[PDB]
């Protein structure tokens, strides 16, 4: 659901990873702030030629188009059956 | 005529022109490196 009504500011609290060395595995997270290298020369941890910062933020401006509008995406994930049932459809255990 | 200008002018090219006013013969290659066919190529990777 769009946070345009609330989180739109631009909103630079919300941020994305503009580049990474490869594609992700499922549910894989990266907190590394390390500096990017697009060349063969070590960057010495600075931006520049073939050296950038891979984490960029999407600016969310209430005047942005629906493409640049923010959306709050939430996923409720479950293993289906055969596993201990903790969250359940509110149907009580019969006799 | 008035406000009518010829697009393509030829320098006078005089051997007495300076290093930067002398006509240079200037070529620029176009090649796509990898990802496109090898026709002009070295060994490519050609092993023994």
């Amino acid at each position, epitope marked *: 659901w769009n946070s345009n009504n609330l989180d739109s500011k631009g909103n630079y609290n919300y941020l994305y990873r503009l580049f990474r060395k490869s594609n992700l595995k499922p549910f894989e997270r990266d907190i590394s702030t390390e500096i990017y290298q697009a*060349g*063969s*020369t070590p960057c010495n941890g600075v931006e520049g*030629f073939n050296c950038y910062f891979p984490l960029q933020s999407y600016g969310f401006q209430p005047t942005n188009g629906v493409g640049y509008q923010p959306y709050r995406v939430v996923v409720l994930s479950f293993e289906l059956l055969h596993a201990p049932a903790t969250v359940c459809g509110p149907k009580k255990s019969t006799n | 005529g008035f406000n009518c200008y010829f697009p393509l002018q030829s320098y006078g090219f005089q051997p007495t022109n300076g290093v*930067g006013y002398q006509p240079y013969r200037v070529v620029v290659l176009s090649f796509e490196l990898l990802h496109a066919p090898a026709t002009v190529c070295g060994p490519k990777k050609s092993t023994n």
Partner: antibody
Amino acid sequence: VQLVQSGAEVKKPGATVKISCKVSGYSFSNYYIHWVKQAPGKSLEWIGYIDPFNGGTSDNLKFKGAATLTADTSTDTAYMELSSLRSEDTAVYYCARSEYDPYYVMDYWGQGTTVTVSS
Amino acid sequence: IVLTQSPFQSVSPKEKVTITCRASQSISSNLHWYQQKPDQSPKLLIKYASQSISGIPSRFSGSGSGTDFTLTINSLEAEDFGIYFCQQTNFWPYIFGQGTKLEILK
């Protein structure tokens, strides 16, 4: 006008000495920064000029260290990272500011980077 | 693009020394010059072979004719001594002059 460079080094043959040359006292972007190899007991020998806006650089055939002159516009640093290192790559490498045309005019180079390349 | 300089010229004070940069095969009007005191950033004496860049003393001068490219230096001073480099321009990358070590008599 002014150039600050990488520190002194002793480098393995085949390793890579990365010599930064950082632009001070002038604008990185307006000038080819030439690079020249003065080895101990030798004279100046051309390796390459960098372009600050143009990553593509003419490199010397001669001694070829696969020298790649990378033009860093954030820190205004023309890098020479010299691979294919050798005891003759022991040298004082002067990064030389010069015009961006086929006008090559280079007066105050880097202070010199005294880099031994040796085992 | 091939040139070479005399390995050194040992001259005397108050004498004039015209240092030779003699280029092989093709030549262009543009050429450059230097003095380098040992182990120091080479300082450009001449520009386009026709121009002493600003800041270079009047005794340091330059010219060229065909393959000949000259740094004309005048009235040596005992402190001046250094190594004098030249630069071939264009015609594919360059051989810096091998340098002239200035050994001043007197």
